[PDB]
Amino acid sequence: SMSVKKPKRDDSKDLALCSMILTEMETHEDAWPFLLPVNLKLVPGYKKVIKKPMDFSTIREKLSSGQYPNLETFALDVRLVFDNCETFNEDDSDIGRAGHNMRKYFEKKWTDTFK
């Protein structure tokens, strides 16, 4: 509350560390469905169904230009990519499986880096 603060967690390396995590997601072999925005002209249904499209390139641009106020807003966009994938793709598809694998991979790096 006013003039009463918990001790200051050092957040000065968060930008650099989220960048490294993102690099590792970008270079994973199962990243291919997630590297670029889904083409909304060419994928019937995507525009109407997926209210908030997100992909690694868009996260990368937001990160590079100071559009994440903190590390949690960054994690929310990453998770949004996998949540969208689950909403549109059958679990037993290459893209559905890619999504489950990438989410697992991300959540481990996230815990190991920050928890």
C-alpha positions as a printed Julia matrix, in Angstrom:
115×3 Matrix{Float64}:
   0.0     0.0     0.0
   1.13    3.67    0.24
   4.79    3.9     1.38
   4.72    0.09    2.07
   6.51   -1.99   -0.54
   7.65   -5.61   -0.91
  11.42   -5.89   -1.64
  12.41   -4.94   -5.29
  12.75   -8.06   -7.6
  15.53   -7.29  -10.14
  13.75   -7.05  -13.51
  16.66   -5.37  -15.39
  17.56   -8.56  -17.36
  13.96   -9.57  -18.23
  14.08   -8.0   -21.77
  17.24   -9.89  -22.67
  16.08  -13.11  -21.15
  12.59  -13.06  -22.91
  14.57  -12.39  -26.17
  16.66  -15.52  -25.59
  13.66  -17.64  -24.86
  11.95  -16.29  -28.04
  15.14  -17.12  -30.07
  15.02  -20.67  -28.81
  11.31  -20.94  -29.75
  12.07  -19.44  -33.21
  14.8   -22.03  -33.89
  12.9   -25.15  -32.65
  12.06  -27.52  -35.51
   8.36  -27.58  -34.63
   8.12  -23.74  -34.74
   7.06  -23.62  -38.45
   3.29  -23.24  -37.89
   3.98  -20.27  -35.55
   6.73  -18.23  -37.28
   4.41  -15.92  -39.27
   0.88  -14.6   -38.95
  -1.81  -17.04  -40.25
  -2.83  -15.72  -43.71
  -6.4   -14.51  -43.04
  -7.26  -14.34  -46.77
  -6.18  -17.93  -47.4
  -7.36  -19.84  -44.3
 -11.13  -20.02  -44.23
 -12.6   -19.61  -40.77
  -9.48  -18.18  -39.1
 -10.47  -14.54  -39.08
 -13.92  -15.1   -37.53
 -13.01  -17.77  -35.07
  -9.62  -16.55  -33.68
 -10.35  -13.24  -32.1
  -6.7   -12.37  -31.29
  -4.18  -13.86  -33.77
  -0.61  -14.08  -32.49
   2.64  -15.53  -33.85
   6.4   -15.45  -33.06
   7.27  -12.72  -35.58
   4.61  -10.4   -34.12
   5.86  -11.17  -30.59
   9.4   -10.43  -31.77
   8.37   -7.01  -33.18
   6.37   -6.12  -30.01
   9.43   -7.08  -27.92
  11.95   -5.1   -29.98
   9.8    -1.95  -29.84
   8.89   -1.79  -26.09
   5.36   -2.94  -26.42
   5.58   -5.43  -23.46
   5.24   -3.55  -20.16
   6.53   -6.55  -18.23
   7.52  -10.23  -18.52
   3.92  -11.44  -17.82
   2.43   -9.59  -20.8
   5.13  -11.34  -22.88
   4.16  -14.84  -21.52
   0.46  -14.09  -22.26
   1.2   -13.54  -25.99
   3.33  -16.66  -26.16
   0.54  -18.75  -24.52
  -2.0   -17.07  -26.87
  -0.15  -18.57  -29.82
  -0.72  -22.1   -28.39
  -4.25  -21.49  -27.23
  -5.15  -20.28  -30.69
  -3.49  -23.36  -32.18
  -5.57  -25.66  -29.93
  -8.77  -23.82  -30.81
  -8.27  -24.35  -34.59
  -6.32  -27.63  -34.95
  -7.13  -31.22  -34.02
  -4.75  -32.65  -31.34
  -3.92  -35.48  -33.8
  -2.53  -33.27  -36.62
   0.98  -32.21  -37.27
   0.17  -28.6   -36.34
  -1.84  -29.68  -33.22
   1.1   -31.75  -32.0
   3.58  -28.96  -32.84
   1.56  -26.69  -30.58
   1.55  -29.06  -27.64
   5.31  -29.64  -28.02
   6.13  -25.87  -28.26
   3.98  -25.05  -25.26
   5.81  -27.69  -23.2
   9.14  -26.41  -24.4
   8.21  -22.77  -23.56
   6.84  -23.51  -20.08
  10.02  -25.31  -19.07
  12.28  -22.47  -20.21
   9.96  -20.02  -18.46
  10.11  -21.86  -15.1
  13.86  -22.48  -15.32
  14.63  -18.9   -16.24
  12.27  -17.05  -13.85
  10.82  -19.35  -11.02
